[PDB]
Structure 1
Amino acid sequence: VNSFSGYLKLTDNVYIKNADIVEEAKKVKPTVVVNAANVYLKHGGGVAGALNKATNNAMQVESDDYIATNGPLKVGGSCVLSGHNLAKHCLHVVGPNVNKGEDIQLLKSAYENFNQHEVLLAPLLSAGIFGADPIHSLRVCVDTVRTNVYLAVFDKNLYDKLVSSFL
């Protein structure tokens, strides 16, 4: 039993809710919140910009030190950093950005990072400003993630389309 509330169950391990991931994280304080990161951990907009804003830019400060030490992530890769006031940890995961021409096949690799954590609060990878089809992202999530994932979808219209079209 966990404290996630109001989710629709899609499969044995995948759950979904129309919610602002920032507000969900502040309420639940999950062990892991997933960020929709880019390889430079520049959290300018989309989910990343919103999560970082909620940390009063502390996420960005920590991320800049991470990059200065380690260099950029790989597309499809991840790193674990602090969750600040939102969660114990933040798993920064880089899905492919279609608006940069990146290989959508890397979306499965991106979701594989979730399997290193027993329970996660997450957005749909590569959705939103990353330009992929969110219906496809949900399909890859369900077919790749085996751990318990609670998906937050900000847009109510999109949430209803994702549920109604789910196979």
Structure 2
Amino acid sequence: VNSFSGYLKLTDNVYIKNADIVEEAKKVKPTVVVNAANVYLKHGGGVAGALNKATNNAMQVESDDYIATNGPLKVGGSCVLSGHNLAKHCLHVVGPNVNKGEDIQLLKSAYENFNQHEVLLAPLLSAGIFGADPIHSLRVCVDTVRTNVYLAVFDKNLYDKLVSSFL
């Protein structure tokens, strides 16, 4: 039993809800919140900009030190950093950004990072301003993640469309 509330159950381990991931994280304070990151951990917009804003820029400060030490992530890769006031940990995961010409096949690799954590709150990777089809992202999530994932989906038209089209 966990404290996630109001989710629709899609499969044994995947759940989905129309929600602002920032507001969800503050309420639940999950062990792991997933950020829709880029390789530079520059949290400007989309989910990343919203999460970082909610941390009063502490996420960005921590991220800049991480990059200065370790260099950029790989597309499809991840790192674990602090969750600040939102979660115990933040798993920064880089899905491919179609508006940059990045290979969509890397979306499966990106979701594989979720399997290192028993329970996660997360957005749909490569959706939103990363330019991929959210229906496709949901399919890859369901077919790749085996741990318990709670998917937030801020946009309402996307959520109903995602629920109504799910196979």
Q: Give the TM-score of the pair, scaled to structure 2.
A: 1.00
Name the structure 2 match of 1:81. Answer: 81
Equivalents in 2 of 1:139, 1:9: separation in Å? 14
Q: Identity rate of aligned residues, in percent? A: 100
For residue 93 of structure 1, report the CA deviation from its aligned partner.
0.0
Equivalents in 1 of 2:61, 2:14: separation in Å? 32
Unaligned stretches of 5+ residues in structure 1: none
- Which aligned segments of 4 or more residues in structure 1 are displaced greater than 6 angstroms? none
Equivalents in 2 of 1:31, 1:89: separation in Å? 6
DSSP 3-state at the match of 2:5: coil
Q: CA-atom RMSD, angstroms?
A: 0.1
For residue 40 of structure 1, report the CA deviation from its aligned partner.
0.0
Equivalents in 2 of 1:51, 1:3: separation in Å? 20
For residue 107 of structure 1, report the CA deviation from its aligned partner.
0.1
Q: Deviations over 1:21-41 (max 9, x none)?
A: 000000000000000000000
Name the structure 1 match of 2:20. Answer: 20
Equivalents in 2 of 1:11, 1:37: separation in Å? 26
Q: Give the TM-score of the pair, scaled to structure 1.
A: 1.00
Q: Deviations over 1:82-133 (max 9, x none)?
A: 0000000000000000000000000000000000000000000000000000
DSSP 3-state at the match of 1:59: helix
Unaligned stretches of 5+ residues in structure 2: none
Paired positions, count:
167
